[PDB]
Amino acid sequence: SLALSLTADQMVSALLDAEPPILYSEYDPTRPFSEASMMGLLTNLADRELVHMINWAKRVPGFVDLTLHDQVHLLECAWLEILMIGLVWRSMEHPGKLLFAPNLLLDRNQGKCVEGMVEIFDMLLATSSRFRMMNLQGEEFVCLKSIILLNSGVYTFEEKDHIHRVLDKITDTLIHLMAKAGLTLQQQHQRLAQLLLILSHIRHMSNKGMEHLYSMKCKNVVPLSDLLLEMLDAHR
Amino acid sequence: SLALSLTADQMVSALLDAEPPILYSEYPFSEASMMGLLTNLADRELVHMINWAKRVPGFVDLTLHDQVHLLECAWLEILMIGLVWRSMEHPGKLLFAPNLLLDRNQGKCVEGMVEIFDMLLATSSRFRMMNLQGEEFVCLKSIILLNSGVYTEKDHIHRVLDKITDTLIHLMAKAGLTLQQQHQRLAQLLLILSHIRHMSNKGMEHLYSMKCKNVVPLSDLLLEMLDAHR
Amino acid sequence: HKILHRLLQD
Amino acid sequence: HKILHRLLQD
Ligand SMILES: C[C@]12CC[C@@]3(CCc4cc(O)ccc43)C[C@@H]1CC[C@@H]2O
Ligand SMILES: C[C@]12CC[C@@]3(CCc4cc(O)ccc43)C[C@@H]1CC[C@@H]2O
Numbered sequence: 001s002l003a004l005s006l007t008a009d010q011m012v013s014a015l016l017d018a019e020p021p022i023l024y025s026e027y028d029p030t031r032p033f034s035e036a037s038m039m040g041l042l043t044n045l046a047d048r049e050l051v052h053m054i055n056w057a058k059r060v061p062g063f064v065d066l067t068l069h070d071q072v073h074l075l076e077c078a079w080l081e082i083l084m085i086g087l088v089w090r091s092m093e094h095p096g097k098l099l100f101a102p103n104l105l106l107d108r109n110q111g112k113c114v115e116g117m118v119e120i121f122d123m124l125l126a127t128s129s130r131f132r133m134m135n136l137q138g139e140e141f142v143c144l145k146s147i148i149l150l151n152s153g154v155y156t157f158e159e160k161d162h163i164h165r166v167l168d169k170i171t172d173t174l175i176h177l178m179a180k181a182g183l184t185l186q187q188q189h190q191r192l193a194q195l196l197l198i199l200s201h202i203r204h205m206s207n208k209g210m211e212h213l214y215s216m217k218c219k220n221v222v223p224l225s226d227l228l229l230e231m232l233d234a235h236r
Numbered sequence: 237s238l239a240l241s242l243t244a245d246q247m248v249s250a251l252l253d254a255e256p257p258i259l260y261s262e263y264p265f266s267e268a269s270m271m272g273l274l275t276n277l278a279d280r281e282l283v284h285m286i287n288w289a290k291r292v293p294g295f296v297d298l299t300l301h302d303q304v305h306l307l308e309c310a311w312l313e314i315l316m317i318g319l320v321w322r323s324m325e326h327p328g329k330l331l332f333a334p335n336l337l338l339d340r341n342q343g344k345c346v347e348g349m350v351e352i353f354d355m356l357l358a359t360s361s362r363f364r365m366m367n368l369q370g371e372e373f374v375c376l377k378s379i380i381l382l383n384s385g386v387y388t389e390k391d392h393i394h395r396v397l398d399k400i401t402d403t404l405i406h407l408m409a410k411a412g413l414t415l416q417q418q419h420q421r422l423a424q425l426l427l428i429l430s431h432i433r434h435m436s437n438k439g440m441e442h443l444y445s446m447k448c449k450n451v452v453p454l455s456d457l458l459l460e461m462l463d464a465h466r
Numbered sequence: 467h468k469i470l471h472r473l474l475q476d
Numbered sequence: 477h478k479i480l481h482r483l484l485q486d
Contacts, residue, residue, distance in 0.1 A: 054483045071484050119466075126387045147427070155358050155431045164424070171423040172416065185415070186402065192419055193401040194394070196426040197379070201387045203430045207437035227479045286473045304470050457469045 003061030003166055008176035011061060011169060015142035018059035020052035022090065025101040038113045039222035045100055046083055047225040053082055060146050062166035070159055076234035077153030080206040080213075081199075082145055088128040089141050095132070098124055116212050123205045130198060134191075139177050143170050144195060152203065210235050239293030239396050244406035247293065247399065251374035254291035256284035258322065261336035267346045271452035275443075277332055278315055279455040285314055292378050294396035302389055308464035309385030312436040312443075313429075314377055320360040321373050327364065330356055348442050355435045362428060366421075369411075375404045376425060384433065440465050 006014065025045045031037060057063055057075055066074075091099045098106050098121065111121035131141075147170055150163050174195070178188040213232055216222050224232070242250065261277050289295050289307060298306070323331045330338050330353065343353035363373075379400055382393050404425070408418045443462055446452050454462070 051483065054480065058484070068481065068484060072478065072480055075480060075484075123388065130387060151427045151430065152434075155355070155362060155428075167423070167427070168420045171420050174423075175419050189405050189419055189422060190398045190401050192422060193397070193404075193426060196423060197383045197397070197429070198387075199427070200383060200429045200433045203433045204384075204437065207434065211441075227483075230478050230480060283473065286470070290474070300471065300474060303474050304468070307470060307474075457473075460468055460470060 001062060001065040001162065001166075003065070004169065006061060006169070008173045011173045012139050012142070012177070014059070014061055015146055016138070018056055019142065020049070020056045020086075023048050023052070023101060025104040027101070027104045033110065033113050035114050036221050038110070039216055041104065042100060043222050043224055043228060045104070047228050049083060049086070050079060050227055050231070053079065057149060060149060061169075062162065063149070065162060066159060070157065073157065074149055074153040076231060077156065078149050079231050080209050081148045081152055081202050084124060084127075084205055084209065085141070085145055085148060085202055088124055088131060089136070091124075091128045092132045092136065095129070096125060098128070114216075116215065120205065120209055120212055123201070123208070127198065127201060127205070134194060136195075137177070137181075140174060140195060143174050143177075144199065146170055147196075148199060148202065151199075237294055237297045237392060237396070239297075239399055242293060242399075244403045247403040248371050248374070248407065250291070250293050251378060252371070254288050255374065256281065256288045256318075259284070259333060261333040263335060265342060265345050268451055270342075270346050271446060273336065274332065275452050275454055275458060277336070279458050281315060281318070282311060282457060282461065285311065289381060292381060294392065294399075295381070297392060298389065302393075305388070306381055306385045308461060309388065310380050310383075310436075311461050312439050313380045313384055313432050316356060316359075316435055316439065317373075317377050317380060317432055320356055320363060321368070323356070323360045324364045324368070327361065328357065330360070348445070352435065352438055352442060355431070355438065359428065359431060359435070366424060368425070369407070371407050372404060372425065375400050375407070376429065379426075380429060380432065383429075 023045060025041050027041050054075065057071070063071065063074075087098060087100065091097060094105060096107055100106060106121075108118055108121045108125065111117040147167060150167055150170075154160060154163050171192070174192055175188050178191055179185075183191065210232065213224075213228075214236070217224055217229070217232060239247070259277060259280050261273050286307065289303070295303060295306075319330060319332065323329060326337060328339055332338060338353075340350055340353045340357060343349045379397060382397055382400075386393050386397075401422070404422055405418050408421055413421065440462065443454075443458075444465075447454060447459070447462065
């Protein structure tokens, strides 16, 4: 592999350059919100983001060295976590609001339009407030998102040694960014721990999000895309 | 508080001394009898967990409701990490009790349990491959107690969490690891908590379905802890 | 009124 | 093969 040869600054520039774009929703402010329309907006947006996430996954250092089967497995376990951390990242500068798209800004009262969604909304907002509290930086965010891709499905598989080697390099990168920011060694270890413990909450939100997605699928209310259905069946 | 003034060695000793005891199971497995043994055992371990939580430094400084919230969110993760810890020396096996060592084939007599068994066994071998030490284990279990529900007084919980991070690093530096190996191992241990959270969510659904099965008699305490996850 | 309450207080 | 399988191969 070549990912093992990149320095910390080269790891950051590779992750920053691979960042997906910010997509717009088909949201029309003239339409009154229904449970079926609001779910349709969010699920349509998520489907289009999934296509960009797949091509973003290829540019994450070390991901192409894996077999095609292992690439599918990691993405199948992590896709909702990656969508959620992306959502809470771009919602950081909007307290009490989730920025699904630049034209789709929603608060917890809007989430009441869809049954069982406010529970997900509150957790997403709490993650966003935590990031804003910690003053999460873009360089740290792209490191955390790459960790999720490589770590979430790694406990459900010699290829694991390569993945753990890449994960260690990302850890070296996180520590390098924190030392560069003037943090003492104690603060570097403490901030590293705080950032990685949030991934436990993100896994929790993904688990609840899957169950919420599965319920809306069985209700046949929201039209789900074929790609999103396959990602949903992978968790069952 | 009092936990913030402790040293790293005093933190380790406080956590080791607080460890709950190893309970025995009640001395041809059916789905009802298997689930009965596992839920009977989990209920008795919950009683010792609650008194162990009181002895985790910083936990008594919380209000009663904050203590309830944290335990309601993390109790299954705490049971699970404890199970995988004492199963480390038994590859391919889960040591629920000294007289109850099970493999994944036995997890088949209860529908849906195999997936949870495989995940638990995967965690145990990961701990075994990393050579997790007891002093590191008690730090992780305490972290689960304080972290799992903190995103749902919070500054104090985060200050205690930072203290446990300092203690974890102290153990790795005491073991001879370089600065790079210290933060790498710290990251490796904390990323497993994401999988442990995953296993717990899978375990809640499995226990909820067995409740509506009416397969197994679940104790009132276990039912109340289960109802905390709406 | 929860069992967890009295187990934490005693 | 799955859709994710196709999108990952070119
Ligand atoms: C719809 C939904 C709301 C939030 C999600 C997760 C992050 C995200 C990003 C995005 O661009 C669009 C949608 C989403 C998909 C969830 C599935 C269930 C939950 O209620
Ligand atoms: C019964 C159960 C299997 C294993 C559990 C998880 C960890 C644990 C520790 C312990 O000491 C006893 C039982 C258990 C409780 C689960 C809930 C659902 C799953 O089927």
